[PDB]
Swiss-Prot record:
Processing and modification events after translation: Cleaved by Rip1 in response to oxidative stress (H(2)O(2)), prevented by Wag31. Cleavage probably occurs near residues 102-103.
Domain notes: The enzyme has an N-terminal penicillin insensitive transglycosylase domain (formation of linear glycan strands) and a C-terminal penicillin-sensitive transpeptidase domain (cross-linking of the peptide subunits).
Superkingdom: Bacteria
Parts of the chain on the Extracellular side: 1-446
Name this protein carries in UniProt: Penicillin-binding protein PbpB
Compartments, record wording: Cell membrane
Family: Belongs to the transpeptidase family.
C-alpha cells in the first residue's frame, strides 16, 4: 500500500496563496491557481501526474511534492514555498505591464520591482502571461516563460550608471563639473554621435547623464580607463547569473577585457556590445539604492515543513560596488533625469517619470536591436528601458522596465518612453504606504 505525499503550496510573502492542491476524485489531486495568470511567469504550471510542468512548480518539484510513504516508511508531505513576492504589488504591476504593452504597441513589456535594501523580488511581470489553470496546449499565443530572467537585451544608455558610478567612485569627476561635450568623437577607431546634433555643449557631469550624452559618457569613461571600467561592470554583477532561484535564468553576456577589440571600449560604456536581463539591470540600480552595496536578488523567502516549522532562505553575500558617499551622489545626480524645465535647458530625458513631492531618481534607456538579416544594428528598432529608485533620499523600491520596440509611450502618447510606466508604479507604491513628501539641478551651464 502507498500513502501519497500531499503537494505543498506556493504562497507570497504574506501567505496569500498562488498555488495549492485540493483532493478530489475521478483519488485525484487538483492543483488550484486562484489568481489565474497572477505571477504565472514565476509560479509555472502542473503536469497530468500532479508534478510540476514548468516554472517553480517544476524547479522546486522535489520540495513541493515530498515523498510517498508506504505500509513502514512515513509519507513526507510537500513543504510550502514562501516567495518574496507581494501579490498586491505583483497584481498592480502585472496589470500595468499589460496595458503599457497595449498602449505603447511594443512587442512585449516586462517590469521588476526589488526591495531597495534587501534585493528581494517584490514583483516580476511580463505581458501576455499564460493561465496555468488552463491546458498549456491551448496557449501557444501566450507567454509561458519568464523573460525578465531568461531573455537578455543590450542595455544601451541605461548602462550609463556604470560610467557614472566609476567616475565618481574613483574621484575623477563631480556632479557639478562643467564639461565641454562635442557632438561627436572618434574613439577606438569608430565614430560616436549624440542622439541629437550639437556643437560643443557645456553640460555638467550631471547633465551628461541627465540628457544621456553618448559623447560625454565616453569622454568621462576615458578618465576611468578600460580596466577600472571592466572591473566595475563585474562588480555590478553583469554577465553572471544572480542566483535568484528561478529556472531558465540567463547570465547575459559581457566580453572579457582580454578579448576586447579596439572599439569595445567605445561601445560598452554607452551600453552597446553587451547584454543583460531585466533582473540584472534592476539589480544594478539596487546597488546604488542600497548605499553602494549590491545584494543579489532572491525570490524564495522561506520554506515551511509539514509540521508548520519555517526556515528562512539564507541571505546572499553582499557585494560592495561603490562607497555609500558615491551611491548617494549618484542617486542625487539621477534626479536630473526626471527634472522638468519648460525652457528645455535643464530638463532630463525622462521628466514624465518624476512624481511631484518625491525625490524620484532614475535613468532612461535606448538601445538599437540587431537585424538578424545583416548581423548589424537596426536603424529604428529599439529596446526602451527605465530603471529608477523611489526615493533618492530614502531608497525603498527599485523599479526596472523594458519595452521591446514601442511605437508610442507606455501611456499611449507620442514618443517611445518607458518613463510614464515608472511614474505610475513608483507613485502608486508611495501612496499605498503613505510615504511623506532642494533647488533645481544644473544639467547645462553657460
Ligand atoms: Co518615433
Ligand atoms: Co501622474
Ligand atoms: Na549581464
Amino acid at each position: 500500500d502507498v500513502q501519497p505525499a500531499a503537494r505543498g503550496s506556493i504562497v507570497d510573502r504574506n501567505n496569500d496563496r498562488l498555488a495549492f492542491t485540493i483532493e478530489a476524485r475521478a483519488r485525484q489531486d487538483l492543483r488550484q491557481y486562484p489568481g489565474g495568470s497572477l505571477a504565472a511567469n514565476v509560479v509555472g504550471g502542473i503536469d497530468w501526474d500532479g508534478h510540476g510542468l514548468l516554472g517553480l512548480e517544476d524547479s522546486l518539484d522535489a520540495v513541493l511534492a515530498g515523498t510517498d510513504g508506504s505500509v513502514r516508511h512515513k509519507a513526507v508531505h510537500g513543504s510550502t514555498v514562501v516567495l518574496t513576492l507581494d501579490n498586491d504589488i505583483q497584481f498592480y504591476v502585472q496589470q500595468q505591464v499589460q496595458q503599457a504593452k497595449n498602449l505603447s504597441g511594443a512587442h512585449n513589456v516586462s517590469a521588476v520591482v526589488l526591495d531597495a535594501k534587501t534585493g528581494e523580488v517584490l514583483a516580476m511581470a511580463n505581458d501576455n502571461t499564460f493561465d496555468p489553470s488552463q491546458d498549456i496546449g491551448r496557449q501557444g499565443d501566450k507567454q509561458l516563460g519568464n523573460p525578465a530572467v531568461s531573455s537578455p537585451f543590450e542595455p544601451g544608455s541605461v548602462n550609463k550608471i556604470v560610467a557614472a558610478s566609476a567616475v565618481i567612485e574613483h574621484g575623477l569627476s563631480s556632479p557639478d563639473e562643467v564639461l565641454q561635450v562635442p557632438g561627436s568623437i572618434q574613439m577606438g577607431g569608430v565614430t560616436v554621435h549624440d542622439a541629437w546634433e550639437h556643437g560643443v555643449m557645456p553640460y555638467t557631469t550631471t547633465g551628461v547623464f541627465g540628457k544621456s550624452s553618448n559623447v560625454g559618457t565616453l569622454m568621462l569613461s576615458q578618465r576611468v580607463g578600460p580596466e577600472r571600467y571592466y572591473d566595475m561592470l563585474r562588480k555590478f554583477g553583469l554577465g553572471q547569473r544572480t542566483g535568484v532561484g528561478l529556472p531558465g535564468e540567463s547570465a547575459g553576456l559581457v566580453p572579457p577585457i582580454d578579448q576586447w577589440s579596439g572599439s569595445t571600449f567605445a561601445n560598452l560604456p554607452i551600453g552597446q556590445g553587451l547584454s543583460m536581463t531585466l533582473l540584472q539591470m534592476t539589480g544594478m540600480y539596487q546597488a546604488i539604492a542600497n548605499d553602494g552595496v549590491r545584494v543579489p536578488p532572491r525570490i524564495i523567502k522561506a520554506t515551511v515543513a509539514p509540521d508548520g516549522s519555517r526556515t528562512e532562505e539564507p541571505r546572499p553575500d553582499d557585494i560592495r560596488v561603490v562607497s555609500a558617499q558615491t551611491a548617494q551622489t549618484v542617486r542625487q545626480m539621477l534626479r536630473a533625469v526626471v527634472q522638468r524645465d519648460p525652457m528645455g535647458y535643464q530638463q532630463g530625458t525622462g521628466p514624465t517619470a518624476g512624481v511631484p513631492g518625491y525625490q524620484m531618481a532614475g535613468k532612461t534607456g535606448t538601445a538599437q536591436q540587431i537585424n538578424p538579416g545583416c548581423g548589424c544594428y537596426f536603424d529604428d528598432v529599439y529596446w526602451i528601458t527605465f530603471a529608477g529608485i523611489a526615493t533618492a533620499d530614502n531608497p525603498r523600491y527599485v523599479i526596472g522596465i523594458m519595452l521591446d520596440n514601442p511605437a508610442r509611450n507606455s501611456d499611449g502618447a507620442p514618443g517611445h518612453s518607458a518613463a510614464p510606466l515608472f511614474h505610475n508604479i513608483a507613485g502608486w507604491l508611495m501612496q499605498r504606504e503613505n510615504v511623506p513628501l532642494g533647488p533645481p539641478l544644473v544639467l547645462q551651464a553657460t
